[PDB]
Amino acid sequence: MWFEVLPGIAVMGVCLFIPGMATARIHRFSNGGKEKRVAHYPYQWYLMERDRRVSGVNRSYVSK
Amino acid sequence: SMVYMNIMMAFTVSLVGLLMYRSHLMSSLLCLEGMMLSLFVMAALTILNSHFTLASMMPIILLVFAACEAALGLSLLVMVSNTYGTDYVQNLNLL
Amino acid sequence: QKRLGVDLDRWMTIQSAEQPHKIPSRCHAFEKEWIECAHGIGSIRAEKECKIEFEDFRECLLRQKTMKRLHAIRRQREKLIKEGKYTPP
Amino acid sequence: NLMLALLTNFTLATLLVIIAFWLPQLFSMKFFLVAITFLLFDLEIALLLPLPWASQTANLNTMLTMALFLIILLAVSLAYEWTQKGLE
Amino acid sequence: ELPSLEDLKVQEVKVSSSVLKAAAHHYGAQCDKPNKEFMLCRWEEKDPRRCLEEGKLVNQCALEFFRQIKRHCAEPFTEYWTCIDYSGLQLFRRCRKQQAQFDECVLD
Amino acid sequence: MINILMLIIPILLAVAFLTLVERKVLGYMQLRKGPNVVGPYGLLQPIADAIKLFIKEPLRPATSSASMFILAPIMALGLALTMWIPLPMPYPLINMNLGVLFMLAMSSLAVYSILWSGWASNSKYALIGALRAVAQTISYEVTLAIILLSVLLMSGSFTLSTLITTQEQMWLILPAWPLAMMWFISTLAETNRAPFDLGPFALFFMAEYANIIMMNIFTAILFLGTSHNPHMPELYTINFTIKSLLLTMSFLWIRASYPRFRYDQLMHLLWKNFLPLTLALCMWHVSLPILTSGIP
Amino acid sequence: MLYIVFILSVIFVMGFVGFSSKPSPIYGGLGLIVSGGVGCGIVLNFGGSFLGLMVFLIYLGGMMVVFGYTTAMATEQYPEIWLSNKAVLGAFVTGLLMEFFMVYYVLKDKEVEVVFEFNGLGDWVIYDTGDSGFFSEEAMGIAALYSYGTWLVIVTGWSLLIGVVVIMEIT
Amino acid sequence: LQAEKDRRVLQMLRENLEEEATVMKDXXXXXXXXXXXXXXXXXXXXXXXXXXXXXXXXXXXXXXXXXXX
Amino acid sequence: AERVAAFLKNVWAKEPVLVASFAIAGLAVILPTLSPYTKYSLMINXXXXXXXXXXXXXXXXXXXXXXXXXXXXXXXXXXX
Amino acid sequence: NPIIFIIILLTIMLGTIIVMISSHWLLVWIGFEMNMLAIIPIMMKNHNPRATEASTKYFLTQSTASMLLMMAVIINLMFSGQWTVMKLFNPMASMLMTMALAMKLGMAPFHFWVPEVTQGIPLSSGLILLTWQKLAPMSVLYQIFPSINLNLILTLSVLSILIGGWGGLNQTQLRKIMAYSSIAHMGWMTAVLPYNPTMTLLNLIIYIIMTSTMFTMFMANSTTTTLSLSHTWNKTPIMTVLILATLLSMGGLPPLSGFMPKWMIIQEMTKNNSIILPTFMAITALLNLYFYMRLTYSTTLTMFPSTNNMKMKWQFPLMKKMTFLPTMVVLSTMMLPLTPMLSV
16 A cells, blocks of 8 residues: 555655755855855846945845 | 967877877877867867957857768778778778 | 859958947957058058057957066066065955 | 865765775677767757857847758758668 | 046945845936936047046935935835845846835835 | 755665665556565665675676776766756756756766776677667757757746746646657656666666656756745745656656567657657747747 | 966866877777866856857767767777887877976966967966956857858758768768 | 946056056066057956956956856 | 648558658748737847947937936837 | 769869858868868769778878868967958968968878879769869968968979979879879969969869860770770770870970960069079979870870770760860960960
C-alpha cells in the first residue's frame, strides 16, 4: 500500500525542500529586508553602486 | 595593450603547431580549431572594449565558418583511413 | 571593390553608422573626424592633411599615448619608497 | 562570485575520487555521418539562437522573411538526408 | 586639460538611497524645464565643462520635488517605498494595490 | 557564501535517497516489494550503499592511462552539480546574465563523461559500444536546442527568472501542446535507460541520476509555474517540489512500462520523424509574436 | 586580487603549449577544453552575455565533441604518456619558456617585447570602458540582428547547405 | 546622468593634485592641454583612469560581469 | 482530382507525421501576410523607447509641446 | 553527380561575386570559404587514392593560408579601426596579409602544393577550376595595392619565375607542366600590382582564356608527354595545329596574343625608372618557353607513337568555348592594342 511509498516521498519533501528555503532565508542575515538585487544590465548595476555611496559605507543595499 | 599581448603570443604557438608535423595528421585540424579560438578572443575584445554594436555580429558569423573548415576538411581525414590503415603524414605517394 | 554595388545596398561595414539601437560607439567622437577629413579623393591619397585627425583617432582605440602617461605616474609612485608620498584616497 | 561557485563543485568532485583510490589496503564509418550532421545543424541553431532576445528594437517585416529563411534551408538539408542516408 | 574648480557644483548631491527615485515617475511631469534644458545643452555640446551651469539647477530642483512630498502626504509615500524594496525589481508588479493609497493623497 | 554547500550536500542526499524511489515506486509498478528489511521502510539502505562502494570496494583498472579514468568521474559529477547554480527556484544562487544558455552549455559538455570512459579502456570491444552511447546523447541535443527556443520566442529572454513571471495565470503546457510532449521523450536520451540503453563506477551513478532530477526541475520551469508570490516564499517552495515529484514518477514510468526502441530506430524516431516536426513548430513559433503582440 | 583577466590569459597560453608540441590527439584534444573554458573568462569579463557563452555551446559543446568521434574513427593507437616520447618534452619546455620569461618582466611594470607596442601595467585601464549605456546596454548586449545585415544571413545559409550536400557525396 | 558627471570631475581633481605632488624635481611633465592632440572634444578619459589609488573601490567599479550583485 | 484527392489519404496512411511538417510550417508563412493584425504589433515595437528621448530647439514647430500631458505628437494609446 | 553538381559549381561562381562586390573584410573571408567547401567535392569526384592525397594537401595548405588573412583583418580592428577593404594602413598587418595572398598567387615560397594538387585531379573539368580560382584573390590585391611594402611583394614575383622556370624542366606529367606554368605566369601578375593597377587584370584575361583553351584541348585524354605524343598520327591531325598555336602563345612570342600582356608589364615598369628588374623578367621568360617548346615537339616531330590500336569513330567531348576562345588566343596582337583601357 501507499503507507510504504509515502515515507520515500516525505524524505524527498525535506531534501529537495532545503535548496529553496536556504537560498531565501539567508537574505535575512545577509541583507536588510530579505531581498537580493538582480544585475541584468548596467542600469540596475549603477543603482547598486550609488546606494552604497549614499551613506552606507560597506553595505550595498540599505534603506535611506 | 596588455591583454592582447598574451593572446598574440598564444596565436604564434598555434601558428607553429600548424607548420609542425610528426607522424600524426590529427594535430593540424586540432590546431585549426585553436587558431580560430585565438582569433575569436582577439576579435571579441576589440569590439567589446571599443563599442560597435553592428560589428559584434561579425565574430558570431566567424564562429560558424570556423567549424565549416573543421568539418569538411575533417571529413577528408576519415577518407585517408579508408584507403590506408591509419592517418599518417609520413604515408604519402605524390611527387 | 572591383565591381561596385548598384541600386541595392548591403554594407553596414564602416565605423560610425546607423547602429542597431540608439547606443553609439565608444570612439564615435573621433570616428566623425576621420570620415569628414577623408570624404574627398585628394586627402587620403595625399595623406598629409588628415595626419592630425588620424592620430587622435589612433589615440582612442589603442590608448597608447595615455598608457605611457599613466606608466610614468605609477612608476614614480613606486619609486617613492621610504620617502614623502601623497595619500588621500 | 561565479568563480567561487564553480571551483567548489569541482574540488568536492575530486575528493570523492580519492576516497575510493587511497583508503582501502590489503571501425564502422557510418557513425561519422551522424556526428558531422550534428555540427552542421547546431551552427544553423547558433544563427537562430538570438531570435527571442534580438526581436525587440528591429523591424518585424524585415526580420520575418529572414528568420523563417534559415529554418527552410535547415529542412532542405534534411531533405537531402532522405535521398539514401544509409542503413543508419 | 583645464579642469573645473574644486568647489564644483551642487551642495549636498542626491536625496538618499536608490529605488526611491525610481518609485516615483511623477518627477517627469513636475520640474521638467531644468531637466530638458540640460538635455538640450548636452546633446548640442558634448563637453560637461560648458553645460554644468544648467546641471546646477537640476540638482537644486531635485531637492524641491522631494521636500513637497515630505511636508504633505508622507504616510502613503513611505508605505510605497517599503513595498518596492521588499521585492526584487518588479517596480510595478505586486505593488499596484499599495499604489492606490498613493496619488489619491497627492490629488488634493 | 555558505549557500553553495547548502546546494551540494542536500542534493547528494537527493541522489542517494533516489535508490528508495527508483525501486519502490518501480516496485509497485511490477507488484514487488522494494526496500523493507534494512530500515523501517528501507530508509537506511540509501546511505548503506555509500558505505559499501566508497570505502571497502577496491579498484582493478584495465590499463589506467596516467590522467584518464581518474578524471572522467570529476567531469561527470562536476558538470551535474554545476547545473544547479543557474536554476531560478524561488531565488537563484548567483544569477547569470543569461539563464538557459548556461543550462544548454553544461549539458552539451556533459557528453564528455561518457566519452572519456570509452578512452579509459584499452580494448576495441568497449569503445564501439561507447560511441553508440555518445550518439544517443549527441543527436537529441540538436532538437533540445530547437524546442527551447520556441518556448523562449513565445515569452521572456534567456534569463530563467523571467520565465516564472510570465506564467502568472496559465501554464505553458496549453500554448505549447505538441512541444510539451517532446520534453518527456528528449530528456530520457541523456543516460536515463528508458528509450535506449548502452569505486569510480559508483560515482557515475551519483552523476547520471543527478541529471534525472535536473531535467524534472527544468521541465517544471519551462512548462509549470502556477503562481509566483514574491511576498510569500513559503507558498512557492512547497508547490514547486510537488510539481517536480510528479515528473519524477513519469521518468520511472517509461523505465518499467516500455521496451527499448533499438539504436537504429532511435534515429528513425528522431531525425527522420522528430526533426521535421520540431522545425515545423519552430516555424509556427516565429510567426506567433508577429501575428499577435508578444515581445518581452 | 588586483588583476582578473591577466591571470586567465596565462592559463590560456598554458593550454596552448600542447599544440606546437605533439602529445597525441587524446592529450592534445584535452588542451582545447582547458584553454577554451578558461578562454571564456577572458571574453566574459569585459562583457558579452551571449557571445561569451557561444564558446561553451559551439567550440566546446559541438566542435571538439565531433573531434572526439574522429580520434576513435582514425588514429586511436591506445592513448600513451606524453613524457616518454622524444622531442615532445623538448618542444613543451621551450614552448612555456617563451611565455614564462615574459611573466618575470611584468614586475616593475614595463616588459620587453618583440612588437613595438608597450605593455606597462593596465589594471584599472584594462577594461577601459565607462558606464554610458543603461537600458538595453552594451554593444554586445544586442550583438546579433537579422536587420541591416540581410546579405550575411543568405550566404551563411547557403554555405551550410553546401556542407551537408558535399560531405554526403565524398563518402 | 548628472551624478555620473559630478563624480568624473571630482575624480579628476584628486588625480591632478597627485600629479603635482609626484612630479616636482626630475621629470619635465607639466600636464597641460591633456593627452589629446586636438583637445576640443575630450572623451571619457576617466574610464581607464578612475584613480589609481585604492584597489578595493577600483575592482568593484570596473568589473560588473564578475560576481554581479 | 489527380493530386489533390489522391495524394492526401495515402499521406495520412503512409508516413502520417509528414503531413504536419508541411501543413504547420506552410501556414506559418501564409498567416502573417493575409491576416490584419500584424500591423498593430510593429507600432508598439517602435513606440517603446530603448534610450532617452532627445530634445529639439523650438523654432516654428507643430505638434510639439512640453513634457506635461498635452495633445502633441503621436503618442501611442492603441487598445487600452 | 546529377543536377546538384551544377549547384556545387554555381557556388564557386557565386563565391567569387562575394569577393568581387565587397566592402567588409569578413565578407571576403566568407567569399574565400565559399570556394573552400565547393572545390573539394569536384577534386574528389570518382574517389581515388591519389585524389584523397591531393584534396587533403589542397585543404591544409589553403585553409591555414586564409587563417593568416583573418589575423590581418583583426589587426585592422586593433589599428586604424574601420572595417573597409580600401587600405591596409599598418605595416605590421601587411606582412601577414601579403604572405597570405602569396599562398594563393605569389607562389615563390608557397608553390609546393601546386604540382601535386594539379596532378591529383582525375578529371579534365577540375583542371579548369584551379586556373579559374586564381581570379578570386586577385580582386583583393586590386583593392589594397597601396600602403603594402613593395620590398616583400616584388621578391614574390622575381623568385616565382625562377622556380617556375626550373620546376617544369624535370617534368613529363602534362598536368605538372601546366602547374608550373601557373607559377611562371603568376610572377607577371605580382609585378604590375606595384607599378600601375591596370593591365594586371588584363593579364588574367589573357592567362585564364589561354589556360582554359589548353585543358579543353586535352579533352581527348592525355596525362603525360608520351600520351599527348600519340595524337598527330593515330588521332586527329588538324587538332594538334591548335595545340601548337596555344603553346606558342603561352611563351613570349610577338605574332601571338600572349606577348600583348608582356608589352605593358615592362612598359609601365620602365616609366618608373626601373631597368634592372624588367631585364631579369625577360631572361627568365625564356626558361618558360622551353617547356612549351618540348611539348610542341609532340605536334611537329614524328616521335614514333603509332600503336596497334586505332580510332575510327568521331570524338564528341564537352567543349564549352574550345572553338571561339582559341581564335582570340592565337591572334589578338592587331586586335588589342588600345584594349588595355577597356578592361579597367
